[PDB]
Write an enzyme that holds these catalytic residues in place. Sequence first.
Site, PDB file in Angstrom:
ATOM      1  N   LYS A  15       0.661  -1.084  -0.161  1.00  0.00           N
ATOM      2  CA  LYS A  15       0.153   0.313   0.573  1.00  0.00           C
ATOM      3  C   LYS A  15       0.639   0.884   0.242  1.00  0.00           C
ATOM      4  CE  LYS A  15      -3.978   1.659   1.793  1.00  0.00           C
ATOM      5  NZ  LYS A  15      -4.031   3.070   1.999  1.00  0.00           N
ATOM      6  N   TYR A  18      -0.948   6.363  -3.005  1.00  0.00           N
ATOM      7  CA  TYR A  18      -2.366   5.777  -3.400  1.00  0.00           C
ATOM      8  C   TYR A  18      -2.695   4.452  -3.513  1.00  0.00           C
ATOM      9  CZ  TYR A  18      -1.180  10.880  -3.757  1.00  0.00           C
ATOM     10  OH  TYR A  18      -1.030  11.717  -4.442  1.00  0.00           O
ATOM     11  N   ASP A 141      10.048  10.449  -3.873  1.00  0.00           N
ATOM     12  CA  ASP A 141       9.900   9.128  -2.229  1.00  0.00           C
ATOM     13  C   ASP A 141      10.814   8.563  -2.041  1.00  0.00           C
ATOM     14  OD1 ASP A 141       8.498   9.108  -0.152  1.00  0.00           O
ATOM     15  OD2 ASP A 141       6.268   7.844  -1.125  1.00  0.00           O
TER      16      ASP A 141
END
Length: 278
Positions: A15, A18, A141
């Site tokens: 997960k 998004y 990220d």
Amino acid sequence: SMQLNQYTLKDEIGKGSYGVVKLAYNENDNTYYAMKVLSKKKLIRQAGFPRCIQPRGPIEQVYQEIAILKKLDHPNVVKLVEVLDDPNEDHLYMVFELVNQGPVMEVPTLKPLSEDQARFYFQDLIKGIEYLHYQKIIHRDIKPSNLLVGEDGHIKIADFGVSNEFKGSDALLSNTVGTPAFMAPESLSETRKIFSGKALDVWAMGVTLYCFVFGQCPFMDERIMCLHSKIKSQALEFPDQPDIAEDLKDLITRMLDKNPESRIVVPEIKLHPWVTRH
Ligand SMILES: CCOc1ccc2c(-c3ccc(C(=O)O)c(C4CCCC4)c3)ncnc2c1
């Protein structure tokens, strides 16, 4: 399970920023994949209600992720193989080649990697990032939880959900997105000066490497304002134990230079003595 075209969707395996990722069996080729399942309406809502200006069409970000992923073909980057998207359906599905072992680490961990294993993964990370950068992509990220380990024991960079494609030589940003403990100091103040996007990826690589060997970030505080202050103002320190090599300390120190103008660049990281020895 449930059926979606030729796929049988099973357990949740991940997960990210998004959606959610499900294990997906492809009955046409007898092969498992990873399927990211998304709601277009939910993505729109995630950007917040229409009124640092919110850009106008937020659903654009997922289609940009898709366009980014379609450009990328590298052994240390995840591979998008199919997009299912009916214009009259709210769901959108992105099918990736599966990377069997999942994330390399979820920070924080009491079980850091050895220096040698950290070097092996970091070498993969460098190959993937230089390729992204060459393709005019900044990831934004980078962190160990977005680094998937394959059966072959190599990392693939995943979760392009906030990635951006730039033109020319670098991305020029006034503000950026990121996981707060991984964000570079230049992105955390209100200043008149824009900053470069590739150097943010390097800072995040640095925090990642530190996490690889120590299991936690170099700057940490549960109070967000204190976390930001430490990123900007606290000198980097290494714990007494485990006792890492001085050349690794040097590399990390250079990646975590608070001044992006002097911070080490990827072509230099590749040639750092810690990286090139075994
Ligand atoms: C036990 C195997 O576990 C996984 C989990 C996620 C995978 C993804 C995957 C595919 C998409 C995404 C995403 O959110 O864009 C993500 C993020 C979820 C958390 C880490 C990265 C992962 N792609 C391929 N293989 C995978 C294998």
